[PDB]
């Protein structure tokens, strides 16, 4: 039995965590969740104890913590503090077209590897004179090499063929230039993988017209934010895609789009797919591959059934009805 940190988060986080536990029970998953809450408190003790809990358990499943952007700059994103404190350097999401979820594009199969600790998320800002604000985007060789190594290794291990570095090196000559140069050094050690690069604006144009051209994509922090959400949208939205955050030792799992979803919270309409797929992802990481495969086949099979669809993908079903169907699919798998 494994002990895994669970951080319910805000909005749809807590309600979906209950369904994760419920699904884990029916599948007899040898996992015990140790819950840690993070309030809206300006004080950091909550987010620090959560870090401590993940340091101990090494693995976590979390909902999204709301960032109040009206508070002073001293009050920093708790999701970001967490991400960067634990040095979870690789944000990884897999956007794949689901046969049961018909959107404007099909045959999308994209692995996005996003630098997850650096860049425009460095929280370095100051006001030199009144009304003049500077924000410091930090790009380093160590972290750019690190994320490129990850993307190429992933591409090779999962039998992918192309890695596309996404950047703005034509304008951000030194910063994005360094990121790209680091990707290129790694590319020389993976001669069997096609390496390409694309400016981030053009990338978004290509994604909304011919997203089938992309295989693995690697990029710094903000561009990952953008591309993740574009690709998540192309395949059907926030309710479908799981996100992983990998460090050398720790790992934290969530939904790809990192959305609070406060406007649909507590209405039994949230799509449970992304969160459940994230928990399978976590089970694989824990080497509980058979449990991961049971649940993942159950949730994917339920998504084939239009009747099980929640409103976010144009259905009319409730969350609990989707879970009912997922559980129905599981208890015939394990007898």
């Amino acid at each position: 039995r494994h002990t895994v940190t669970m951080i319910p988060g805000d909005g749809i986080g807590p309600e979906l965590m209950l369904h994760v536990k419920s699904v884990f029970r029916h599948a007899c998953v040898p996992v015990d969740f140790e819950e840690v809450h993070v309030s809206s408190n300006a004080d950091e003790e909550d987010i620090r104890n959560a870090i401590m809990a993940i340091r101990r358990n090494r693995v976590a499943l979390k909902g999204n913590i709301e960032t109040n952007h009206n508070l002073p700059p001293s009050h920093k994103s708790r999701n970001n503090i967490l991400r960067t404190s634990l040095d979870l350097y690789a944000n990884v999401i897999h956007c794949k077209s689901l046969p049961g979820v018909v959107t404007r594009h099909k045959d999308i199969d994209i692995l996005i590897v996003r630098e997850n600790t650096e860049g425009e998320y460095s929280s370095l800002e100051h006001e030199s004179v009144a009304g003049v604000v500077e924000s410091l985007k930090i790009i380093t060789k160590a972290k750019s090499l690190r994320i490129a190594e990850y993307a190429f290794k992933l591409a090779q291990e999962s039998g992918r063929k192309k890695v596309t570095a996404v950047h703005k090196a034509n304008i951000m000559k030194l910063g994005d230039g360094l990121f790209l140069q680091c990707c290129r050094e790694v590319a020389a050690r993976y001669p069997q993988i096609t390496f390409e690069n694309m400016i981030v604006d053009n990338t978004t144009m290509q994604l909304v017209s011919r997203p089938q051209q992309f295989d693995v994509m690697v990029m710094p922090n903000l561009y990952g934010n953008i591309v993740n959400n574009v690709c998540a949208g192309l395949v059907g939205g926030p309710g479908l895609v799981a996100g992983a955050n990998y460090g050398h030792v720790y790992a934290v799992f969530e939904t790809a789009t990192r959305n609070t979803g406060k406007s649909i919270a507590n209405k039994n309409i949230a799509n449970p797919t992304a969160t459940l797929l994230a928990s399978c992802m976590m089970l694989d990481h824990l080497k509980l591959h058979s449990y991961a495969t049971s649940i993942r086949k159950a949730v994917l099979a339920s998504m084939d059934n239009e009747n099980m669809h929640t409103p976010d993908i144009g259905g009319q079903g409730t969350t609990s009805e989707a879970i009912q169907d997922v559980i129905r699919h599981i208890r015939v798998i394990n007898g």
Binding site: H69, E120, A130, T140, S209
Partner: protein, 323 residues
């Protein structure tokens, strides 16, 4: 009958620019064309290029070759506001058909401050600059644009959750202009939310106002929804009433003089130009003539019909005559 500075540019630049002049005359527009070739010299743009624009106020620009001339023009004329109206085009069919969005990009600062430092070996700092003055001005323009073009909603797009002090200040200036302009409906949205929703239901968005990089990227994404850079207008508003309207696609050198080019974008930028000054009547005619031509079928260009540039141009002229 006022004069418009014309910058044909390179490659297909002359061809398409000729096509726009032919259509503007066929519509009997009170505009005469004052051609000017910009080129960086001494850097700076030529004496006669600067001078035409300084008295005329209005320019039209085809695709240029690549000190960037587009960067020069921005600093020379303080082009602070990039405007890109993306409207889904009937006949030319993408997977998105309900699009009607204006992206308003702060064009002077933000993450294009031009300031990068090597802090130590293997550590680079790129400075994102957000100022009170520049943010208020783009916000004032965004709301002023909305009123004048009969637009209900303005959305400020930001990442103030992550960049609190900088995107926050930009937002604070957007809020101050908004409360002093209760006419237009104002909301705030995270950049990632905008991106997520845009590719699902782009019909929900109206006027998007944002700092430089977000604007740089979204203007391109929105253009990708409606067909590309080949069919998309663009305007740049500056200081002292100067304004340049432009093509943003390539020069396409490999078809430069084969009567094989598409002037839709340059035309739509020209239509956009007529609206800015106040000649709303003519603007509507040429536009409807253009849209009906594309909807019509065979008169199409190669990127769009197995037809030449000059037929397509000729059909539009013909149709704008029969208002």
């Amino acid at each position: 009958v006022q004069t418009v500075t014309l910058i044909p540019g390179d490659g297909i630049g002359p061809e398409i620019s000729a096509a726009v002049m032919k259509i503007f005359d066929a519509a009997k527009a009170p505009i005469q064309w004052e051609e000017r070739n910009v080129t960086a010299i001494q850097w700076m743009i030529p004496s006669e290029a600067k001078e035409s624009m300084d008295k005329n106020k209005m320019g039209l620009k085809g695709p240029l070759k690549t000190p960037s001339m587009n960067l020069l023009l921005r600093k020379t004329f303080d082009l602070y506001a990039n405007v890109r109206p993306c409207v889904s085009i009937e006949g030319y069919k993408t997977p998105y058909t309900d699009v009607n969005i204006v992206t308003i990009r702060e064009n002077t600062e933000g993450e294009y401050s031009g300031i990068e430092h090597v802090i130590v070996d293997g550590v680079v700092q790129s400075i994102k600059l957000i100022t009170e003055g520049a943010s208020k001005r783009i916000a004032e323009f965004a709301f002023e644009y909305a009123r004048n073009n009969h637009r209900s909603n303005v959305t400020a797009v930001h990442k103030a959750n992550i960049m609190r002090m900088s995107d926050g200040l930009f937002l604070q200036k957007c809020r101050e202009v908004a409360e002093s302009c209760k006419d237009i409906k104002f909301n705030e949205m995270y950049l990632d939310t905008v991106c997520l929703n845009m590719v699902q239901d782009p019909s929900q968005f109206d006027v998007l106002v944002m700092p430089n990089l977000y604007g740089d990227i979204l203007s391109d994404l929105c253009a990708g929804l409606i067909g590309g850079l080949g069919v998309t207008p663009s305007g740049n508003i500056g200081a002292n009433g100067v304004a340049i309207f432009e093509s943003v696609h390539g020069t396409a050198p490999d078809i430069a003089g084969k009567d094989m080019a598409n002037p839709t974008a340059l035309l739509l930028s020209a239509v956009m130009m007529l609206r800015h000054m106040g000649l709303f009547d003519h603007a509507a005619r040429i536009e409807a003539a253009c849209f009906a031509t594309i909807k019509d079928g065979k008169s199409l260009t190669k990127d769009l019909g197995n037809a030449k540039c000059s037929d397509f141009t000729e059909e539009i002229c013909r149709r704008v005559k029969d208002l």
